[PDB]
Amino acid sequence: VDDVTGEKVREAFEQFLEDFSVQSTDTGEVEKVYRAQIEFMKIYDLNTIYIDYQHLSMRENGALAMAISEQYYRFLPFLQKGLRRVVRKYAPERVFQISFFNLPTVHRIRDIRSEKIGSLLSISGTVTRTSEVRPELYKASFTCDMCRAIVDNVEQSFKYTEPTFCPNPSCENRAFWTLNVTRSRFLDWQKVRIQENANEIPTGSMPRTLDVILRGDSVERAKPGDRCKFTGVEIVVPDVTQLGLPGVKPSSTLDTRGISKTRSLGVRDLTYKISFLACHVISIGSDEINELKEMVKDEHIYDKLVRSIAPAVFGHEAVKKGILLQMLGGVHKSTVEGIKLRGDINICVVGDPSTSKSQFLKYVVGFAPRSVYTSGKASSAAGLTAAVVRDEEGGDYTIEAGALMLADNGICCIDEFDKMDISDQVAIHEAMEQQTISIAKAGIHATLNARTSILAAANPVGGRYNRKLSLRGNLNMTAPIMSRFDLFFVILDDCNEKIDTELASHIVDLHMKRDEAIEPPFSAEQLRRYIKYARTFKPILTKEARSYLVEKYKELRKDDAQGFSRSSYRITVRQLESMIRLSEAIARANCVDEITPSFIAEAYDLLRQSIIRVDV
């Protein structure tokens, strides 16, 4: 009957997907749908499917929907067997995986209970520590020598033992083993440990991770250091480590009241911990190209970019460009044989506090994807590098994300270089010099690439100028890391009644719900797709107007040679080398290829004011 009722749920679902899945009429997407899905999957014959939940919830009034959700672990077998049925019917090596998506609801990891156990659910969080993909049995051919092997079955649920029955023969048993690795079916898998989304956690409860195992072609879909959304397949894993928890803890002591006395006691504690599982993994969290064109056409969209960057911040116009030109980087490629050029860019904002230098930062971690924000002094160490994680268990050498490196080909933002002392700064130097992060700790040696831009905000020795002092002496970070940051864009705020009035006005404006009507010419959402478009260019200047650049380099150092009591610097050749990446940056900005001598002049003047601010 339970077999019969369950089987009824089978037939009901099978009828569902065979019954019309689509009400869309006329222009479409006209019916069916899912048949089209089976067939589109039959195109490349990779044997897994995606079918939406919402439809299924709507059709039957939900009796079937609820019947699936609540008892879902009960109802797996009927479902994939049903899919196998339809496949057998309409279609001609059998591995099938069914994953719903688009649930009506989202549940926080902290809101997970045991009443939703074994039942499909939705959980969104920040992925951490992915783990290399390892095979799994679930179908194995294992038997004794006597009298024959090749029996292939069982080990369904995680055990992993053993053959169920019809041993040996003729030694009939009981017994055990032997397992073949020559005959069995394997799938996947990779484990990932997901964390609660940073923004959500209840004070001061602090985040708590849970573990989600990835089987299915859903493998590798997850990404380290990313928000993701999962659908349930929820289950349980047993845990030895809970003892002295305290109790009272349940046990297995068997009931022997059958049979008769003429095995022993056989007691095994059962202590489980909840760990989520995943069938479906998404990274959530033509008409537009017309807009993109509309952006590249206009002659002002540069200026639009600049003015529209950081609404919260008021003016300065320097650090606007300073922020954007990191998002759009140079060629960072070639020149071989040999050692590779840089490429990317760096900036360190310096100034008397209250200058809202931090607002930029928060705006960058807000705006651009692949951006990590730390306040270090508390880095603390690694932090910006990898642990590496050991053990796992089962071989370990699994690597933590983490901090700096988990943001890669991107903009990492650090407050206060001046607080982190010696230890880590050296590591950062190792990142911005050798470009690679070499990691060896008490175990497996390693090399892990991080190619990144580093935006820092560094407070002066006394938090002030010191206009008369050399900037070299003011910032108070060591020479080698200093010379790799080009360039600083120092800000100091001084009292001007017009500007003062404008500040008070603007700030009071901000703290007013009205008017919040202050708006940038570009919306924060579109500026991303614009930028990502502008990233796909490979700006290259063959143009012989590059000759001009030389004299420009040349024009720059001469007047700055005498006196030496000017802002020098030198001006270092690395600044010639810097003008390049700056140029290419502006090329990225304006979509123009081979650029102009004019844009070169813009990058130039930019560096110039960045110098003069150092003069006094």
Added chain:
Amino acid sequence: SEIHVRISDFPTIYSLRELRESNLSSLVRVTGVVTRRTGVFPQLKYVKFNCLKCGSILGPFFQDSNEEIRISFCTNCKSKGPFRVNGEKTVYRNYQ
């Protein structure tokens, strides 16, 4: 006594990261950077057993990569004077 072959060129060229259970037991070429590696060790090659009570030598067998088992029944007996590998007349091959 033996020449085993290295083959040459079979793309594929699975870089490293992308491999699945479909690829195991099947020939696969791979590229990547050598990291720290263990020293050189001997491997059993031809395995031989002096037994105990049943005298000697029980002769060379081939095992294995990597099993080396089970040496079930031989030579008088087969028990209880059962098998212990010896240093002499067992040949080894390097392993890393």
